């Protein structure tokens, strides 16, 4: 998932760059969120946790 997260947030980065500048500026902001939240120093750390820390959500 770490490889999919980077390739995902990476793809999104390129998508936003080639997305906006036409008629989807706001949409660009959305993609950006996914990028920052993705490459976030904290986010990546959590992704690593998944290795062997099944975080069961109850208040999801």
């Amino acid at each position: 998932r770490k490889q999919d997260t980077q390739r995902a947030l990476h793809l999104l980065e390129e998508y936003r760059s080639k997305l906006s500048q036409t008629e989807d500026r706001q949409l660009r902001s959305s993609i950006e969120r996914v990028i920052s939240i993705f490459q976030s120093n904290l986010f990546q750390a959590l992704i690593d946790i998944q290795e062997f820390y099944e975080v069961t959500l109850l208040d999801n």
Partner: protein
């Protein structure tokens, strides 16, 4: 940071195909990302990401 961690993912998740529409990113690549965003565990990383980031 907690909202976009999931909200943001859903925005791009819905517009993804719209993006291919005006970007030519290819639905194939979009599908891969839909999965990258469809995962449930991800929402855990996203929700937890903001939790600690907003815990201080």
């Amino acid at each position: 940071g907690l909202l976009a961690a999931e909200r943001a993912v859903s925005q791009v998740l819905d517009s993804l195909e719209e993006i291919h529409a005006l970007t030519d990113s290819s639905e194939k690549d979009l599908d891969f990302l839909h999965s990258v965003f469809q995962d449930q565990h991800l929402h855990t990383l996203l929700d937890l990401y903001d939790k600690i980031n907003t815990k201080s």
